[PDB]
Amino acid sequence: MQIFVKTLTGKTITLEVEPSDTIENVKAKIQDKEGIPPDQQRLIFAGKQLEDGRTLSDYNIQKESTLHLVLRLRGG
Amino acid sequence: PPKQRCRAPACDHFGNAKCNGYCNECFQFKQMYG
Ligand SMILES: [K+]
Ligand SMILES: [Zn+2]
């Protein structure tokens, strides 16, 4: 199963994933492809922000669904 | 000028012209990973 992640540059990232994969997993995949620390990643699907400990399926993300990636700094 | 949302997907910050329509924050990230 593949999904797509759209970045701030309009680039589409293609990820090989499973329905049971977590959001944290998906962000770790993005870090591998792009080099972006997961704590700076905000994933959005259907306009809703996605929580680290939840599965893709929990958000009804399906084969070849597209997510949006927003990047934010963290100051603590 | 009038106001405009950042051109980055799903970003709801305001963009500016010095950053080509992105907000400052996305423009920083863009200078890094773009
Ligand atoms: K936007
Ligand atoms: Zn922005």
PDB file of all heavy atoms in Angstrom, chain A residues 24-43:
ATOM      1  N   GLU A  24       3.612   8.224  13.902  1.00  0.00           N
ATOM      2  CA  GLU A  24       5.027   8.320  14.251  1.00  0.00           C
ATOM      3  C   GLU A  24       5.877   7.536  13.255  1.00  0.00           C
ATOM      4  O   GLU A  24       6.954   7.975  12.847  1.00  0.00           O
ATOM      5  CB  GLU A  24       5.259   7.798  15.669  1.00  0.00           C
ATOM      6  CG  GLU A  24       6.719   7.656  16.047  1.00  0.00           C
ATOM      7  CD  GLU A  24       6.915   6.899  17.351  1.00  0.00           C
ATOM      8  OE1 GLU A  24       6.024   6.105  17.727  1.00  0.00           O
ATOM      9  OE2 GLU A  24       7.965   7.096  18.003  1.00  0.00           O
ATOM     10  N   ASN A  25       5.382   6.371  12.857  1.00  0.00           N
ATOM     11  CA  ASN A  25       6.058   5.582  11.838  1.00  0.00           C
ATOM     12  C   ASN A  25       6.146   6.330  10.523  1.00  0.00           C
ATOM     13  O   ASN A  25       7.158   6.266   9.836  1.00  0.00           O
ATOM     14  CB  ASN A  25       5.332   4.261  11.586  1.00  0.00           C
ATOM     15  CG  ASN A  25       5.712   3.192  12.571  1.00  0.00           C
ATOM     16  OD1 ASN A  25       6.711   3.313  13.276  1.00  0.00           O
ATOM     17  ND2 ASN A  25       4.922   2.125  12.619  1.00  0.00           N
ATOM     18  N   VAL A  26       5.073   7.023  10.166  1.00  0.00           N
ATOM     19  CA  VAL A  26       5.012   7.687   8.871  1.00  0.00           C
ATOM     20  C   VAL A  26       5.977   8.863   8.858  1.00  0.00           C
ATOM     21  O   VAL A  26       6.615   9.156   7.845  1.00  0.00           O
ATOM     22  CB  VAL A  26       3.580   8.133   8.537  1.00  0.00           C
ATOM     23  CG1 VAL A  26       3.553   8.986   7.275  1.00  0.00           C
ATOM     24  CG2 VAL A  26       2.683   6.913   8.384  1.00  0.00           C
ATOM     25  N   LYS A  27       6.109   9.516  10.005  1.00  0.00           N
ATOM     26  CA  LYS A  27       7.016  10.646  10.133  1.00  0.00           C
ATOM     27  C   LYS A  27       8.471  10.183  10.132  1.00  0.00           C
ATOM     28  O   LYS A  27       9.357  10.886   9.642  1.00  0.00           O
ATOM     29  CB  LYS A  27       6.706  11.442  11.400  1.00  0.00           C
ATOM     30  CG  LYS A  27       5.402  12.246  11.358  1.00  0.00           C
ATOM     31  CD  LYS A  27       5.150  12.896  12.711  1.00  0.00           C
ATOM     32  CE  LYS A  27       3.953  13.834  12.705  1.00  0.00           C
ATOM     33  NZ  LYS A  27       3.762  14.421  14.068  1.00  0.00           N
ATOM     34  N   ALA A  28       8.716   8.998  10.681  1.00  0.00           N
ATOM     35  CA  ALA A  28      10.048   8.398  10.627  1.00  0.00           C
ATOM     36  C   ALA A  28      10.428   8.028   9.190  1.00  0.00           C
ATOM     37  O   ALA A  28      11.595   8.120   8.807  1.00  0.00           O
ATOM     38  CB  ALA A  28      10.122   7.176  11.526  1.00  0.00           C
ATOM     39  N   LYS A  29       9.443   7.598   8.405  1.00  0.00           N
ATOM     40  CA  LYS A  29       9.655   7.325   6.991  1.00  0.00           C
ATOM     41  C   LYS A  29       9.997   8.608   6.256  1.00  0.00           C
ATOM     42  O   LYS A  29      10.878   8.629   5.393  1.00  0.00           O
ATOM     43  CB  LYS A  29       8.416   6.670   6.383  1.00  0.00           C
ATOM     44  CG  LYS A  29       8.168   5.262   6.909  1.00  0.00           C
ATOM     45  CD  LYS A  29       6.898   4.649   6.348  1.00  0.00           C
ATOM     46  CE  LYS A  29       6.620   3.286   6.974  1.00  0.00           C
ATOM     47  NZ  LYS A  29       7.723   2.311   6.740  1.00  0.00           N
ATOM     48  N   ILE A  30       9.307   9.688   6.608  1.00  0.00           N
ATOM     49  CA  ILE A  30       9.578  10.984   5.996  1.00  0.00           C
ATOM     50  C   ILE A  30      10.977  11.478   6.364  1.00  0.00           C
ATOM     51  O   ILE A  30      11.695  12.016   5.527  1.00  0.00           O
ATOM     52  CB  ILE A  30       8.488  12.023   6.342  1.00  0.00           C
ATOM     53  CG1 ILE A  30       7.182  11.657   5.633  1.00  0.00           C
ATOM     54  CG2 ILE A  30       8.931  13.429   5.936  1.00  0.00           C
ATOM     55  CD1 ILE A  30       5.916  12.242   6.274  1.00  0.00           C
ATOM     56  N   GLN A  31      11.381  11.265   7.608  1.00  0.00           N
ATOM     57  CA  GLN A  31      12.735  11.629   8.015  1.00  0.00           C
ATOM     58  C   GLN A  31      13.787  10.884   7.197  1.00  0.00           C
ATOM     59  O   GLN A  31      14.810  11.457   6.828  1.00  0.00           O
ATOM     60  CB  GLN A  31      12.940  11.359   9.499  1.00  0.00           C
ATOM     61  CG  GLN A  31      14.348  11.622   9.978  1.00  0.00           C
ATOM     62  CD  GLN A  31      14.502  11.393  11.462  1.00  0.00           C
ATOM     63  OE1 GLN A  31      13.825  10.543  12.045  1.00  0.00           O
ATOM     64  NE2 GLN A  31      15.390  12.158  12.091  1.00  0.00           N
ATOM     65  N   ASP A  32      13.530   9.606   6.911  1.00  0.00           N
ATOM     66  CA  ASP A  32      14.429   8.803   6.090  1.00  0.00           C
ATOM     67  C   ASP A  32      14.559   9.348   4.672  1.00  0.00           C
ATOM     68  O   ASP A  32      15.660   9.429   4.140  1.00  0.00           O
ATOM     69  CB  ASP A  32      13.966   7.344   6.047  1.00  0.00           C
ATOM     70  CG  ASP A  32      14.171   6.639   7.365  1.00  0.00           C
ATOM     71  OD1 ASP A  32      14.765   7.259   8.265  1.00  0.00           O
ATOM     72  OD2 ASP A  32      13.760   5.469   7.502  1.00  0.00           O
ATOM     73  N   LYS A  33      13.434   9.714   4.069  1.00  0.00           N
ATOM     74  CA  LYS A  33      13.414  10.200   2.690  1.00  0.00           C
ATOM     75  C   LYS A  33      13.941  11.623   2.542  1.00  0.00           C
ATOM     76  O   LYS A  33      14.587  11.952   1.542  1.00  0.00           O
ATOM     77  CB  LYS A  33      11.986  10.169   2.139  1.00  0.00           C
ATOM     78  CG  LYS A  33      11.340   8.800   2.079  1.00  0.00           C
ATOM     79  CD  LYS A  33      11.764   8.045   0.843  1.00  0.00           C
ATOM     80  CE  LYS A  33      11.073   6.694   0.772  1.00  0.00           C
ATOM     81  NZ  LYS A  33       9.591   6.852   0.772  1.00  0.00           N
ATOM     82  N   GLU A  34      13.652  12.464   3.533  1.00  0.00           N
ATOM     83  CA  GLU A  34      13.846  13.910   3.408  1.00  0.00           C
ATOM     84  C   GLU A  34      14.830  14.511   4.403  1.00  0.00           C
ATOM     85  O   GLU A  34      15.328  15.618   4.192  1.00  0.00           O
ATOM     86  CB  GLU A  34      12.504  14.629   3.551  1.00  0.00           C
ATOM     87  CG  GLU A  34      11.411  14.143   2.611  1.00  0.00           C
ATOM     88  CD  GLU A  34      11.722  14.418   1.156  1.00  0.00           C
ATOM     89  OE1 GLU A  34      12.323  15.472   0.859  1.00  0.00           O
ATOM     90  OE2 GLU A  34      11.376  13.569   0.310  1.00  0.00           O
ATOM     91  N   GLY A  35      15.077  13.813   5.505  1.00  0.00           N
ATOM     92  CA  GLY A  35      15.987  14.308   6.526  1.00  0.00           C
ATOM     93  C   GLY A  35      15.375  15.256   7.552  1.00  0.00           C
ATOM     94  O   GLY A  35      16.097  15.938   8.279  1.00  0.00           O
ATOM     95  N   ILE A  36      14.050  15.283   7.629  1.00  0.00           N
ATOM     96  CA  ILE A  36      13.347  16.205   8.517  1.00  0.00           C
ATOM     97  C   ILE A  36      13.008  15.537   9.839  1.00  0.00           C
ATOM     98  O   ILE A  36      12.293  14.534   9.853  1.00  0.00           O
ATOM     99  CB  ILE A  36      12.022  16.682   7.886  1.00  0.00           C
ATOM    100  CG1 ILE A  36      12.278  17.363   6.543  1.00  0.00           C
ATOM    101  CG2 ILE A  36      11.290  17.631   8.822  1.00  0.00           C
ATOM    102  CD1 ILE A  36      11.024  17.566   5.719  1.00  0.00           C
ATOM    103  N   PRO A  37      13.502  16.102  10.956  1.00  0.00           N
ATOM    104  CA  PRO A  37      13.194  15.570  12.286  1.00  0.00           C
ATOM    105  C   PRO A  37      11.690  15.493  12.487  1.00  0.00           C
ATOM    106  O   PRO A  37      11.004  16.469  12.192  1.00  0.00           O
ATOM    107  CB  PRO A  37      13.766  16.636  13.229  1.00  0.00           C
ATOM    108  CG  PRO A  37      14.806  17.329  12.437  1.00  0.00           C
ATOM    109  CD  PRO A  37      14.300  17.339  11.028  1.00  0.00           C
ATOM    110  N   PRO A  38      11.185  14.353  12.984  1.00  0.00           N
ATOM    111  CA  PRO A  38       9.743  14.141  13.176  1.00  0.00           C
ATOM    112  C   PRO A  38       9.067  15.141  14.117  1.00  0.00           C
ATOM    113  O   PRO A  38       7.860  15.349  14.013  1.00  0.00           O
ATOM    114  CB  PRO A  38       9.673  12.734  13.767  1.00  0.00           C
ATOM    115  CG  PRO A  38      10.915  12.055  13.243  1.00  0.00           C
ATOM    116  CD  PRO A  38      11.964  13.135  13.273  1.00  0.00           C
ATOM    117  N   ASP A  39       9.818  15.752  15.021  1.00  0.00           N
ATOM    118  CA  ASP A  39       9.207  16.707  15.931  1.00  0.00           C
ATOM    119  C   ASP A  39       8.924  18.045  15.233  1.00  0.00           C
ATOM    120  O   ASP A  39       8.286  18.930  15.797  1.00  0.00           O
ATOM    121  CB  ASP A  39      10.050  16.886  17.200  1.00  0.00           C
ATOM    122  CG  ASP A  39      11.480  17.279  16.905  1.00  0.00           C
ATOM    123  OD1 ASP A  39      11.699  18.258  16.164  1.00  0.00           O
ATOM    124  OD2 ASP A  39      12.397  16.599  17.413  1.00  0.00           O
ATOM    125  N   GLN A  40       9.393  18.176  13.998  1.00  0.00           N
ATOM    126  CA  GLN A  40       9.137  19.369  13.211  1.00  0.00           C
ATOM    127  C   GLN A  40       8.068  19.100  12.160  1.00  0.00           C
ATOM    128  O   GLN A  40       7.690  19.998  11.415  1.00  0.00           O
ATOM    129  CB  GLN A  40      10.424  19.862  12.548  1.00  0.00           C
ATOM    130  CG  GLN A  40      11.424  20.456  13.519  1.00  0.00           C
ATOM    131  CD  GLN A  40      12.687  20.937  12.838  1.00  0.00           C
ATOM    132  OE1 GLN A  40      13.149  20.341  11.862  1.00  0.00           O
ATOM    133  NE2 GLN A  40      13.249  22.028  13.342  1.00  0.00           N
ATOM    134  N   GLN A  41       7.581  17.863  12.110  1.00  0.00           N
ATOM    135  CA  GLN A  41       6.571  17.468  11.132  1.00  0.00           C
ATOM    136  C   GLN A  41       5.162  17.546  11.690  1.00  0.00           C
ATOM    137  O   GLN A  41       4.891  17.082  12.796  1.00  0.00           O
ATOM    138  CB  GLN A  41       6.828  16.043  10.644  1.00  0.00           C
ATOM    139  CG  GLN A  41       8.212  15.836  10.080  1.00  0.00           C
ATOM    140  CD  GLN A  41       8.403  14.438   9.538  1.00  0.00           C
ATOM    141  OE1 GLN A  41       7.460  13.823   9.038  1.00  0.00           O
ATOM    142  NE2 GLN A  41       9.620  13.922   9.639  1.00  0.00           N
ATOM    143  N   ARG A  42       4.264  18.140  10.919  1.00  0.00           N
ATOM    144  CA  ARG A  42       2.854  18.105  11.253  1.00  0.00           C
ATOM    145  C   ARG A  42       2.137  17.516  10.058  1.00  0.00           C
ATOM    146  O   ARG A  42       2.121  18.117   8.987  1.00  0.00           O
ATOM    147  CB  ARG A  42       2.320  19.509  11.534  1.00  0.00           C
ATOM    148  CG  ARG A  42       3.054  20.279  12.627  1.00  0.00           C
ATOM    149  CD  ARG A  42       2.531  19.959  14.026  1.00  0.00           C
ATOM    150  NE  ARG A  42       3.124  20.827  15.041  1.00  0.00           N
ATOM    151  CZ  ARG A  42       4.336  20.649  15.562  1.00  0.00           C
ATOM    152  NH1 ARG A  42       5.090  19.631  15.163  1.00  0.00           N
ATOM    153  NH2 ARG A  42       4.800  21.489  16.480  1.00  0.00           N
ATOM    154  N   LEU A  43       1.556  16.336  10.227  1.00  0.00           N
ATOM    155  CA  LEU A  43       0.823  15.718   9.130  1.00  0.00           C
ATOM    156  C   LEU A  43      -0.665  16.052   9.186  1.00  0.00           C
ATOM    157  O   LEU A  43      -1.276  16.029  10.254  1.00  0.00           O
ATOM    158  CB  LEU A  43       1.043  14.206   9.109  1.00  0.00           C
ATOM    159  CG  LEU A  43       2.370  13.731   8.520  1.00  0.00           C
ATOM    160  CD1 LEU A  43       2.600  12.279   8.855  1.00  0.00           C
ATOM    161  CD2 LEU A  43       2.378  13.928   7.013  1.00  0.00           C
TER     162      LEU A  43
END
